[PDB]
Amino acid sequence: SISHSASATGNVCIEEIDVDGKFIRLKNTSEQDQPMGGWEMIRKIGDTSVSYKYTSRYVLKAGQTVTIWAANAGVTASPPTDLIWKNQNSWGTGEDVKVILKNSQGEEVAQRSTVFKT
């Protein structure tokens, strides 16, 4: 029914796509701090893809998580754990979603999908 898929080649993975459509959470599962300056997160739903760009000095430290919140989720920025997706509002529920993570060289280093199926 509700099905999950995901993979990563590096230190950072996409941990969760909020079923409620209010956040995407990532985690550094490694023992290495991960510089993410210039990194890009892409959310695709249907024909539409929306980009988030990590700020230049952003670092996801070893074992830590980062939650990227919809601008209307009612959450205040709290770096480094909680960041806000500028001008991007919560995106609903129940439509297939795929998130891809790219490094500064544009290489896909992680991905996660949620698929709903009958």
Curated annotation (Swiss-Prot):
Signal sequence residues: none
GO molecular function terms listed in the Swiss-Prot or TrEMBL record: phospholipase binding; sequence-specific double-stranded DNA binding; structural constituent of cytoskeleton; structural constituent of nuclear lamina
Cell location: Nucleus lamina
Phosphoserine PTM positions: 104
Post-translational modification note: B-type lamins undergo a series of modifications, such as farnesylation and phosphorylation. Increased phosphorylation of the lamins occurs before envelope disintegration and probably plays a role in regulating lamin associations. Phosphorylation plays a key role in lamin organization, subcellular localization and nuclear envelope disintegration.
Main location: nucleus
Cross-linked sites for Glycyl lysine isopeptide (Lys-Gly) (interchain with G-Cter in SUMO2): 102, 117
Keywords carried by this UniProt record: Acetylation, Chromosomal rearrangement, Coiled coil, Disease variant, Disulfide bond, Glycoprotein, Intellectual disability, Intermediate filament, Isopeptide bond, Leukodystrophy, Lipoprotein, Methylation, Nucleus, Phosphoprotein, Prenylation, Primary microcephaly, Ubl conjugation
Domain LTD intervals: 1-116
One GO CC term on file: nuclear lamina
GO biological process: heterochromatin formation; nuclear envelope organization; nuclear migration; nuclear pore localization; protein localization to nuclear envelope
Subunit structure: Homodimer. Lamin dimers then assemble into dimeric head-to-tail polymers. Ultimately, two head-to-tail polymers assemble laterally into a protofilament with a uniformly shaped rod of 3.5 nm in diameter. Interacts with SPAG4 and SEPT12.
Function: Lamins are intermediate filament proteins that assemble into a filamentous meshwork, and which constitute the major components of the nuclear lamina, a fibrous layer on the nucleoplasmic side of the inner nuclear membrane. Lamins provide a framework for the nuclear envelope, bridging the nuclear envelope and chromatin, thereby playing an important role in nuclear assembly, chromatin organization, nuclear membrane and telomere dynamics.
Disease involvement: Leukodystrophy, demyelinating, adult-onset, autosomal dominant, typical: A slowly progressive and fatal demyelinating leukodystrophy, presenting in the fourth or fifth decade of life. Clinically characterized by early autonomic abnormalities, pyramidal and cerebellar dysfunction, and symmetric demyelination of the CNS. It differs from multiple sclerosis and other demyelinating disorders in that neuropathology shows preservation of oligodendroglia in the presence of subtotal demyelination and lack of astrogliosis.
UniProt protein name: Lamin-B1
Interval of the full protein contained in this chain: 431 to 548 of 586
